[PDB]
Design a protein around this nucleic acid. Structure first.
Lengths: 340, 74, 73, 20, 74, 74, 341, 20, 76, 72, 76, 71
DNA sequence: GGAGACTAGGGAGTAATCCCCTTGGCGGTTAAAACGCGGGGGACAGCGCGTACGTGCGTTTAAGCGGTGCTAGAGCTGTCTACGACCAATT
DNA sequence: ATTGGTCGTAGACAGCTCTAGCACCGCTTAAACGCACGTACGCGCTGTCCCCCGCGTTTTAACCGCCAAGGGGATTACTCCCTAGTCTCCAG
């Protein structure tokens, strides 16, 4: 594979907080969006060059946010863009600067930095995580709050929606994971001891964990044994099956490619899934069947990483850091594996 | 010293906007009355200040928007 | 509703504010200021009371809103 | 300045898997 | 005899917040004494304001005016 | 932030000391909690202020007796 | 009669607010208590001299009050002394400085200046009037409050207890009178329009009205028709039978002698007549039950506004207090007012 | 200063009561 | 009951007045009100400082005490 | 100006303030204390006089001011 | 960026330090950070006053307007 | 305190978008400069003494920003 | 050491600044009415309270010794003793 | 006019501060423990609704005088726009 680092400041030399690719993309060109302290959300056009190296093209600027923006999210269909941050306003941008975007609904109800947003599979439900110690469920069509999960006692820096639409996985800064059943609207599980997770000393503002695209397994970063990434299953969420050791700095991000790859084992199904884990200064690339990582890139950013994102086809793996610079990982035709 | 019940159902209607079926106890009602009265007296005082500043006795909204921009309102 | 900010009530509150002479358009730009800042303050107040798992706002929420708006009293 | 060290596709042993 | 309910390590860590390092054990009793006498002081005015609203139940607004009387509004 | 049950015992005991047949609000109770917290911590910064002027680190009651006499609440 | 003015400062030249005689006295010597800005309650010994002029003898000083004292009251039996003021604390003093007094029960619950206190006939129930817009009923034996009357909308400056123990009469600065039945503990009558009384412009901090010792009639000073003093009856409290004209300064004090005098226009029809004293800002008028016109009038004896007046146990002494720091007395000879029953 | 005017017991008319 | 030389006080307060607004006429009553406030607050302050110095165990008084008291007061 | 208060006057007022041994520099911080105190009082007096439209400062104005900062 | 000379700022800082207490060393990084925050705040109130004057419908500025802004802030 | 040069004030003014400036601007600008300088250094040493340190640090000014609300 | 900057300084000229209508929108006036204040069930459905639960990190005793309060002796200094001059002050 | 109020000088030593001396009781675990905290949940119950009627004080509309926001113009006043030494910040 090849790694290309963006050496031009995307948001005028300010730290980058989030990245997201357009899930609605279905071809070779993918649309990427960025969040920064400049209170602006920049959507870029990312496509491979003739040599295969990543090329970034600026499309639009979204300066409606009054304060800094921490998380930017695309809908699974790619229609609606979710953006919230220091001003704590969740904007549902829609395609109306090369292009233009307009906010559909104002999903207000948060107080300060909103760190993690996860789209439900249907795209009509939102999970919102912010410093305010709460998780709020919203209706996209209604644009109104319907459920509240404020049991968190520290900075809620990570949340993901179950692809099967059964539970809600939340990671807070209190080294405690909280699972919320989607039908009961109450806490399903509580795990804090094998502490298991890293304390406030971990320097990343995010604790973004994500379910496996099928939802069978849950990968949680920022763990302790030493820094590691624990793996949970739907069968038992109160004991991790295994952990991936990451000596050095603590892992902060877990992102899984939405493309199912053929087997060339954490979970036993005829398909394997390649996911990306971002630490403070290193990135380890694993797959479902192989315990050891098949890829590792480091010493490419001068400061702490913030967010990563896979492309729709898996050909792009964007990496964002806090130094104002970003980077991408480019794979050739089906280098990761054979798609299903 | 705004009249009590007109102000209270101002607050009630503008609270219903976020989501219906909201109950407010009289304690918080007089609390928010205190808040509104404090703000309005402060802003009115500063408007008088910037008005005699403007060397006109009569009040003008431009004074108001001025105060907003200095007080960080917009 | 919104016109509940009564015109001579505005007059007497201006009196307590030391205002000398009053024009008509003030009588509804005051409604605008009142509605927008109450929108803000009851916004963060309902958030604060949602932290308490409480379905009713409190004077505690109000006073914290005033601290956040820099008019503590 | 930084000295980049890049490892290609080897189908690292310092990061070998550890189980429990 | 709930007065002793304010303990040694609690007062010690309030002291830590206070801005001291070393404090003797002989200060815990005087601490509970000052606490009880001034809660007496504040709650007297609190219950007066409570009775003013024909209330048989105290409200959080009362302590506000109590501190205003005491000159320590918050 | 200090503790809850012993202080609720304190306020209930002093309440029955004043008069029986009375009720408290939970929110009002915790409000009284941070009120007493703030008052005591402020007194204790006064304590530190005196002790530093007393050019001694450890504190003896005469510091807090100053605190009170100097502001003269009692 | 003779009038003697006290030209020596009782409370170190500070204004005097109240005066009260020991209701427990039964002979010739009477005990008088004074309240002033100096946070002290001075009980004096008042007795007629060889020439009949009043003589004042200092007995005790009561400095427990942290702030000024506005009203001082003795029990109908004379045992317990009620004293409250700026510090808003009601002290029940008792005989434990020629003599000494000690507070029995601390009847707290008031907020600021307490202006009027009235003792119930039994002595076990208290009426307290203060600026705080309320009147609180207390238990003397229990030392605890039992009832609340918050209908007052301005400075409460006058209250009295019905001798029959049925209603409570209150006067507040809002030119509105409020009557509270002692059984229901609610407002029984309310009169505001005939304004009916004087507004806040009247310069006396007190609106002390008192019932007739039998309770049949109520004498309410500081009225407006010009300044006047309206009279009510138990039959109808919503309409005055008559008012006593006092043009000039407004009447502020009404006190009735506790001695029943025989009959020698009539306000009320019973075989006995009662002599009462009304004190205005600078004048004092002395009436009786049977005569419409006053049979006594003393003025130009104090340099500032009068504050309180008090009758003796036998009616031989009528103490007068003013806001100039000086007091005065009115001395009547043997049964000069009339022949007691 | 003040000039004291004292009226003795006469069994004045400026204060004669008027009934209603 | 005053000891500060009254007309020097009057000239002080007057000169302060024309430092802000010129031609301010003051009467005896205003001057004595300013006085009574003056001696009242200063005697309270010295009461404070003396008792604090007694806490200081030191007979002499030096303005670390008055600075101490004012940093209590919240005036700065 | 501020020198309207004399050092012997400061000393005698301090003497009846209950103090016996005094240093010199007190004579100057006391003037600063006095001016800091009186500026707020005179400002409030000006505000009240403008409210009442009375150019001359009255005794009751100062008294109600002292009530406002609470040393009536 | 920086438009104020380092040495005058440092020497006034040392002046106030020796007025308060000697032997208080100042590091270059902290000095420059405090200086840039200083410039940011002063320029912020500066265009605050500029907008004030813009309302004052007089292009030239006079500092009493700035003092109005002060009491808007309530600093003194 | 004189070190804040008046031409520096004028060029910062030119950056501020003003056109004509009264002369007496400089003294009050310096005064309200130093009042906030004093407030910030006071908060800085307040945190520093709790930190048991003697030297100013960027953390102190960051906490000053947090306290005054200019962050 | 040496090169940008600032401090000292004329020019007038554009920018405040005060005067003079000047009218039109605004300060009190009036009549009533119209919501403003209120109180009373109604108990229905909202609300807290006590206690049980458990169990776990805060709370309690203590070694223990040494960093910090406590005492002696300076010891060297700035009052406050007396005063001799000025010196503002009441009339 | 005089008259008490003030000011500034000379040093003895009283006492604030500094150093030396001393002991003793806050940290600092280790272990016992306990109530602090979290939810249910039945039981208590407090705040309440809200209508109208009672009823009544204030709101609103319109008038009419008239005070003032703003225009006009004359009036002064204050940074140009260099001119020049300087002086000192910073680089070498």
């Amino acid at each position: 594979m090849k790694v290309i680092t963006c050496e031009i400041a995307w948001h005028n030399k300010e730290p980058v907080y989030s990245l997201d690719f357009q899930h609605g993309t279905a071809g070779r060109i993918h649309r990427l969006a960025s969040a920064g302290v400049d209170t602006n959300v920049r959507i870029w056009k990312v496509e491979k060059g003739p040599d295969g190296k990543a090329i970034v093209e600026f499309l639009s600027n979204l300066a409606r946010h009054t304060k800094a923006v921490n998380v930017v999210r695309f809908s699974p269909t790619g229609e609606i863009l979710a953006s919230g941050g220091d001003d704590a306003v969740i904007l549902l941008w829609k395609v109306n600067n090369k292009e233009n975007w307009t906010v559909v609904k104002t999903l207000r109800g948060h107080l300060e930095d909103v760190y993690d947003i996860c789209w439900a599979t249907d795209g009509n439900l939102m999970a919102s995580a912010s410093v305010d110690n709460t998780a709020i469920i919203w209706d996209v069509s209604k644009g109104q709050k319907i459920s509240i999960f404020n049991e968190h006692k520290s900075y809620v820096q990570g949340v993901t929606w179950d692809p099967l639409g059964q539970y809600v996985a939340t990671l807070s800064c209190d080294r405690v994971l909280r699972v919320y059943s989607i039908q009961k609207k109450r806490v399903a599980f509580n795990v804090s001891k094998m502490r298991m997770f890293h304390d406030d000393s971990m320097k990343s503002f995010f604790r973004r964990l994500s379910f496996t695209p099928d939802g069978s397994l849950l990968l949680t970063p920022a763990g302790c044994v030493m820094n590691t990434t624990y793996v949970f299953s739907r069968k038992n969420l109160k004991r991790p099956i295994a952990h991936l050791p990451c000596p050095g700095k603590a892992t902060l991000a877990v992102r899984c490619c939405p493309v199912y790859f053929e087997l060339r084992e954490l979970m036993s199904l005829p398909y394997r899934l390649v996911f990306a884990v971002a630490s403070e200064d290193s990135v380890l690339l694993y797959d479902t069947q192989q315990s050891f990582p098949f890829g590792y890139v480091s010493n490419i950013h001068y400061h702490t990483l913030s967010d990563i994102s896979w492309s729709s086809d898996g050909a792009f793996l964007a990496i964002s850091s806090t130094d104002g610079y970003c980077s991408f990982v480019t794979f050739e035709k089906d280098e990761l594996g054979i798609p299903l | 010293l705004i009249r009590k019940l007109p102000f209270q159902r101002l607050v009630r209607e503008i609270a219903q906007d976020f989501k219906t079926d909201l109950r407010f106890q009289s304690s918080a009602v007089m609390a928010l009355q205190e808040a509104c009265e404090a703000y309005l007296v402060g802003l009115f005082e500063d408007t008088n200040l910037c008005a005699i500043h403007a060397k006109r006795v009569t009040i003008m909204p431009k004074d108001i928007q001025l105060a907003r921009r200095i007080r960080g309102e917009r | 509703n919104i016109q509940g900010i009564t015109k001579p009530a505005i007059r007497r509150l201006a009196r307590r504010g030391g205002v000398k002479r009053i024009s008509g358009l003030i009588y509804e730009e005051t409604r605008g200021v009142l509605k927008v800042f109450l929108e803000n303050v009851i916004r963060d107040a309902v958030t604060y009371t949602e932290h308490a798992k409480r379905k009713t706002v409190t004077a505690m929420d109000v006073v914290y809103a005033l601290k956040r708006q820099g008019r503590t009293l | 300045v930084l000295q980049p060290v890049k490892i290609g596709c080897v189908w690292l042993q310092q990061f070998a898997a550890c189980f429990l």
